């Protein structure tokens, strides 16, 4: 797993150099805004079913024919699978917002998760909108000022955008 | 024709079925032919 | 805590054993394992099942 | 699904062997009571519009803290899919009377229940409610070992659902 | 993936050693070892080309150190429960 | 795993609507003959022994290469290997005759014996002649009208001619 | 662990005789109230969690120090576990009422169920009257003629009684 | 023995649930089953004596080898302990029959049955042909369902030896 | 197959080291074995067709009621194939001889031998006849240690089948 | 796995024959110089962290691109499992010059190196280079006369050659 | 697991000394008899079925009431395991015979045989029967004259009757 310090490393390592003065600056930044990074987190976490169920009901009625008789969502069982696959997802854009890093990301919920929704017949465009409506949903969260100190926290907002994105984008 | 003529009359039926029996097979496969193929002989001969 | 289950088998093992063959080399009948708390409950009922009896439990 | 036929069929793939004397006659039982089940299927799918209607508005009357506004059976689409959902139990319910095995309704109901009615807030007493009605209903509709086999499945779900 | 899911990691694992599986073969004792190269009972006779599949020769390992990664093998394979091409197996088998 | 009934509710779910009318007749009419297969099923499970026997003989007298030094049954493992094959797939095929369908023989069957074999050198040929003489040796035993009620079973003569009929394709 | 049938073979073979014709007239008159049987363990478990959830609701207005703070019912998973223990003691007497035997109880659980709460020192004197209080609502639960046609089976009960009253002495 | 009841009792309590409609189902054709199959009981039981004669007689006929000196079917010892044997055979069909179940049989005769006959040389095809004697009588000493019952008992005895 | 080289090598590789003096030693042992088993082998594969004939004559003697009408040991076919059962025998000893452990035996007899036996209805004892036979004449036409070995053979392979 | 011996039995088996005169009389001539080949696999043996430390420093004295920062024996970990590598060919050599046939090699050694090595990224050039380091290193050991009865052995200098050959040509 | 070697290895160890000259040749005579040994344990392993039918034979004549329904050897599968039981003890006797030293056959297999046998209802006192049966057909096997040059082997005799009773007492 990397987190932002262990890629930095880990290129270091790769020239064979110690850490520039440069690399170390953007290092410090980082931990720095390491306390809004947990907010953000947090925001993730704490508010996480309702998150996925305003995502679940947005995308159900959006798309009706998933919750009727042949659709993917249609048995109990598939839709539970169909919210659980959606709090994994969550769960692991939570991981990398807190490491700084979309490695997890990839290599644990991205890995080939596109060829497994393609085998079961799972269409990719839905869990890809399904994706984008958890993300709206989370900016909504995530934006929000009540029990938190006011300040400037838009490059948390565009890199969260940037690991739901990606999701989307490897799903399809 | 003469050839196969002797070797059905002449001789006895017991023996020449014995041979035909013990003719090499056209499938040349040895005992761990199958093993060798998947690659498991070592994981298959290891001791428990 | 964790629980010491000392396991016997008198017959309900070795009918067991008997029909489906002997399948993992043989071993001596009377022997006992130490299992969490977490793990007793599926542990016992698993001996239950397989026909062993328990003598006794401790815990420590 | 697991049937009585699945069940004795995976049991002797285990083991496997052929499918022996009490297997065989597992398989007999079923057959021959296919025909009350089948009959009690028969009568179920023909008053399911009765059955629905009367389950939807019992759960109504069971709780009438859900029809009013900023709750679960306020709407009429909400209503709609009432009925739809208490069809769905109806629908697995001679499901599983025709294939002589609850397997219909774990597979399709019962595998997931908790999670979703989790998910989406649905107080899965309602829909006791509504299957302890099509309970009460069931013995008007039905008789002899038609209502016995149609009773087990209904309360199977009841059970599952509690 | 439920199992993992719901309990987390070391429910996953005690799943697969309490199973009654390993006990009936490995049985508190023994060292597992490769069973899928003989017919087991109960096999799907897909599971012997999936272990072909998922071994990769004495001298091979399952590392993570790989160049693309430690990617899944078998996705496709178990989804569909074969390559697909069965039907067109039996059309082949008659007339041509 | 499918027989005749589940696979006729998963048509019916996928329609979204109850059994019909004529399906129940159909279901009704095969648990009716219920009995008939049952005791094919009985007749093939009482006689595997020698159905297997007397398919393994056929087999290699017509395909003597098979037994010779280097043949594939030639050592003690391979020939046992062959009859368990043999026993296995009779075994499925009467499972397929208990449950009216074909599923449970080519899912955990079929599917990938073809390439099991084609993996370990085996050939499917004969195989395959192997189940037809099953085939063979086991409608004579089918139609045995000793210690049963005479009567009518063609249709499930038929059904088990499909069966092996079928193993028979896939495996070649 | 074995059935009554197998319990009479059982001492049929310990005297090595064939079964004797009065053991046959009672394994009959056991295969006759078969069907009243099955009624009476049907009735259990279809009505298992009322029976539990009474059974608790009584144990514990009988019994608040269960209940209390460094009580054995506190916190949720202890009372969790008393709930799971009710439900396999239940389970285990309907598993015994259809066998028609007392030691395919004492088999399963009640050898070692006794040695389990010393050792977590649990009060058995409680377990047993929870056991008591659920044989009270499974009595009541059992006597219940509706859907059901009417008839005796005082003999049914009697033996519900014994093997509650088992499990409650064993544990006890 | 592992019979129909009790495995019903043993898959319950594998998966920790309870009797479902599908156990209740095995065990009331069992429970309905077992007039025949108690019959069949007594009437194996009453022509014992003259089916164990028959068989060994039978055994004698078909390996007519057996019986000269200096081969294990000469002398008393070994004639009474075929008759032993063969009544044995006779009351574990019984015993199976009563239960139900060939748990009887398995337990009794099936497990240790193959190397306990390597041990001491007994050819099954003995014991295969005793039974096709018995089996041959009871088609003819049993009517209707209970020749079924008492025939397949036989075979899956037959299936065993072989 | 499993001779003395490759059990050292096997378990030497088991344990992931090299050949230590243990191995080396039990080589050695097989290396100085070498001269008395080869030409035991020798000796046997000169004599192969005599050992064969009396084996098969052997067991026709101590067995004469297969070689008349309806059963295994009569006609040309399965005279034959009796030949070629003791000729494999016969091979598959000599090779046990040549590679210094029963590992040809054990691969290629042995492994699977009940189960074939058993489905082709081949009594082992006709075999255990035939291996007592080579074993008498192995007596006489092997000297001090070559007789040890072919006799621990032929054991082997008589111990297996019975 | 196969010695000579076996490999000899095999081919004999696929003729359904015995093993000639010539034959036995190669295997016996096999055998009488077995003392030999056991001081060659002692030889092997008793210097095998000679022959590695040899091969090693000769090969990063060769390839020093082998041990920069991104090479493929650069940290302290691929290092290791380089000279764990070398240390297992060198003992499957012994282990064939043992037992006479390259058999243990391509079934266990070889079986699936290659691709392990391809999909590592592992220069397989080098470690073909490495083996062929080794096979130097280990002649020295091998044709060493001292604390030996001096003897002709120039066919298992030949034999363990072609052995150390057979790895690298596998490798590259 | 020792031999003679290692177990005097072992007090020469406790005493902390080099092994004596007394011992060295007290070992060297060991070896030389060795081959003794290899005969006595070649003896002992080729008539293993032999001697476990005589004494199966020998001890059911004598001890008729294991035989008898409700005795330990009645039901068949007992009878196997009481088979399979002889032919450990006659396989671990044989093993310490070779060994020199008895220590494996008891560590291995009789440490626990006695408890294992009083929790099962087996008589112990049968079992140390039938390995003294084992024990006088050995001995008639072990003598045999025949087979082997003549030669005095009074000390092997008396070691493996050594061994048969010491795992008779273990026993019983
Ligand atoms: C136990 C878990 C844990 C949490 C949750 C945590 C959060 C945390 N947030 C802080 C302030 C802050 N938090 C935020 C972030 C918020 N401001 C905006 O409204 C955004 C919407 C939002 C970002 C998503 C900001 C901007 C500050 C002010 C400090 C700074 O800007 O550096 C501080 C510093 C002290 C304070 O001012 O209260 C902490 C420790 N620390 C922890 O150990
Ligand atoms: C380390 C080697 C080892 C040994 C030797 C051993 C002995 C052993 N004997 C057993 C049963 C048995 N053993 C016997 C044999 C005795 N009873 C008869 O009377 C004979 C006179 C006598 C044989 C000489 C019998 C009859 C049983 C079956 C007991 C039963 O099922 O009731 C069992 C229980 C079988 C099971 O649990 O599946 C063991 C473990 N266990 C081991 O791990
Ligand atoms: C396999 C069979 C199956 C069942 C049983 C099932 C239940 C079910 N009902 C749903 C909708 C719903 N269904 C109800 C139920 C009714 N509303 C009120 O009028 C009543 C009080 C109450 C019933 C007594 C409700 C409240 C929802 C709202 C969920 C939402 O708003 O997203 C949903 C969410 C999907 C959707 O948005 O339509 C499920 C999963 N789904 C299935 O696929
Ligand atoms: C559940 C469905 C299923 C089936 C049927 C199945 C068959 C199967 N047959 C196998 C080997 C074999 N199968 C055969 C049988 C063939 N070769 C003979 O010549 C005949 C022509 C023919 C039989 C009529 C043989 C000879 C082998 C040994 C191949 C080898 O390892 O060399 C193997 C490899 C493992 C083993 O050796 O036991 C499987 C898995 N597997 C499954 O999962
Ligand atoms: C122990 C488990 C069990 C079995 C095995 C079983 C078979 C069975 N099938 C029956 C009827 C029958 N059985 C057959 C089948 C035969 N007729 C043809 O000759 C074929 C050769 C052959 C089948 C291929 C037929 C045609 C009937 C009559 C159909 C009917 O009852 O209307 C009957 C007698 C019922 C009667 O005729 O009144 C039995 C007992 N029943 C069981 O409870
Ligand atoms: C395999 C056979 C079997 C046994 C032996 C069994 C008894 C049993 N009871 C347990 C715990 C427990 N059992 C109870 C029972 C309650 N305490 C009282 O208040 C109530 C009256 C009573 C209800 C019956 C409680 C409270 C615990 C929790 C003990 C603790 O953690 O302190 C546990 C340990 C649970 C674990 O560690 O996972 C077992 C095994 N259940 C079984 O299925
Ligand atoms: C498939 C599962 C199943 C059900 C649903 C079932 C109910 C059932 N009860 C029956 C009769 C009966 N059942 C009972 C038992 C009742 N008497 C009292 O009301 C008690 C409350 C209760 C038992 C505790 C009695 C007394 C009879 C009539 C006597 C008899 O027919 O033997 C019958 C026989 C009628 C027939 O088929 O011809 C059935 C099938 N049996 C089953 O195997
Ligand atoms: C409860 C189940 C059970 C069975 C089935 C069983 C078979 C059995 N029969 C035996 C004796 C025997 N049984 C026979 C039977 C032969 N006599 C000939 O007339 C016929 C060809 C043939 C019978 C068809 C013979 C010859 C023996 C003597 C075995 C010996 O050589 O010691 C023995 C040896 C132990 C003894 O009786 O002292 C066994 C184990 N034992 C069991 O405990
Ligand atoms: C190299 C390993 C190997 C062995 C040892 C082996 C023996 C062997 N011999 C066979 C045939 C046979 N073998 C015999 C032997 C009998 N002939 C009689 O004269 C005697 C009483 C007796 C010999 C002492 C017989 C009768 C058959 C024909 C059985 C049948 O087809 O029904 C068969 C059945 C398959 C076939 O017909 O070819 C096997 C497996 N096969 C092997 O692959
Ligand atoms: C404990 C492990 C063990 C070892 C190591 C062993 C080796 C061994 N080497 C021997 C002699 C010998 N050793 C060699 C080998 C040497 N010749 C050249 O100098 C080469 C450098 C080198 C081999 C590559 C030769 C040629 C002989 C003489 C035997 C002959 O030429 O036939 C001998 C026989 C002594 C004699 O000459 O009478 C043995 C037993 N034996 C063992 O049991
Ligand atoms: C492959 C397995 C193997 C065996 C079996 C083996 C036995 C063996 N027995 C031998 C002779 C002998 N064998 C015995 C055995 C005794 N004779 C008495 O009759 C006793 C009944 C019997 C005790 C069991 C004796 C005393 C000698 C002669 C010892 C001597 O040469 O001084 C010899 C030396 C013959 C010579 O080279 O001159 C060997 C190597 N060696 C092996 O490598």
């Known amino acids: 797993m990397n987190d932002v310090f262990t890629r930095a490393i880990a290129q270091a390592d790769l020239k064979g150099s110690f850490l520039l003065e440069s690399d170390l600056d953007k290092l410090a930044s980082f931990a720095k805004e390491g306390v809004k990074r947990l907010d953000a987190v947090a925001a993730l976490t704490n508010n996480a079913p309702a998150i996925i169920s305003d995502a679940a009901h947005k995308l159900f009625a959006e798309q009706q024919e998933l919750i009727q008789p042949g659709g993917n969502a249609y048995p109990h069982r598939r839709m539970a699978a169909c919210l659980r696959d959606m709090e994994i997802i969550l769960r692991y854009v939570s991981y990398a917002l807190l490491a700084g890093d979309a490695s997890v990301l990839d290599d644990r919920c991205l890995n080939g998760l596109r060829e497994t929704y393609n085998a079961l017949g799972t269409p990719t465009q839905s869990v890809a909108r399904a994706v984008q409506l958890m993300k709206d949903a989370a900016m909504v969260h995530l934006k929000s000022t009540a029990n938190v100190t006011v300040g400037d926290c838009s490059s948390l907002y565009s890199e969260a955008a940037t690991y739901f994105d990606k999701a989307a984008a490897s799903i399809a | 024709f003469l050839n196969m003529a002797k070797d059905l009359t002449s001789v006895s039926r017991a023996e020449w079925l014995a041979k035909s029996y013990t003719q090499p097979s056209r499938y040349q496969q040895t005992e761990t032919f199958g093993q060798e193929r998947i690659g498991a002989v070592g994981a298959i001969e290891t001791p428990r | ?60 | 699904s697991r049937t009585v036929i699945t069940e004795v069929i995976a049991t002797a793939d285990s083991q496997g062997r052929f499918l022996n004397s009490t297997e065989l006659q597992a398989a007999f039982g079923r057959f021959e009571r296919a025909v009350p089940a089948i009959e009690a299927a028969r009568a179920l799918t023909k008053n399911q519009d009765a059955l629905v209607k009367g389950a939807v508005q019992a759960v109504f009357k069971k709780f009438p803290y859900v029809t009013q506004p900023g709750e679960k059976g306020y709407g009429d689409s909400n209503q709609a899919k009432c009925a739809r959902d208490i069809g769905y139990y109806l629908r697995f319910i001679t499901y599983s009377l025709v294939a002589s095995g609850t397997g219909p309704l774990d597979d399709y109901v019962i595998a997931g229940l908790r999670e979703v009615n989790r998910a989406f807030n649905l107080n899965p007493l309602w829909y006791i409610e509504a299957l302890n009605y099509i309970k009460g209903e069931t013995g008007k509709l039905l008789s002899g070992q038609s209502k016995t086999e149609a009773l087990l499945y209904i309360d199977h779900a009841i059970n599952a659902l509690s | 993936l439920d199992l993992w899911n719901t309990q987390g990691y070391d429910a996953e694992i005690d799943s697969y050693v309490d199973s009654e599986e390993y006990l009936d073969f490995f049985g508190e004792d023994t060292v597992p070892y490769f069973r899928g190269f003989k017919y087991q009972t109960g096999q799907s006779a897909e599971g012997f080309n999936r272990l072909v599949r998922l071994y990769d020769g004495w001298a091979g390992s399952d590392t993570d150190r790989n160049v693309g990664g430690q990617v899944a093998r078998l996705t496709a394979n178990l989804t569909r429960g074969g390559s697909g091409l069965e039907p067109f197996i039996v059309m082949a088998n008659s007339r041509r």
């Not at chain 3, 093992?13 to 993992?24: E, P, V």
């Open chain 3, 1 to 60: 805590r964790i629980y010491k289950i000392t396991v016997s088998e008198a017959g309900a093992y070795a009918t067991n054993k008997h029909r489906t063959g002997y399948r993992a080399p043989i071993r001596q009948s009377n022997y006992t394992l130490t299992v969490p708390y977490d793990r007793f409950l599926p542990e016992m009922i698993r001996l239950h099942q397989s026909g062993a009896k328990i003598v006794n439990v401790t815990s420590v």
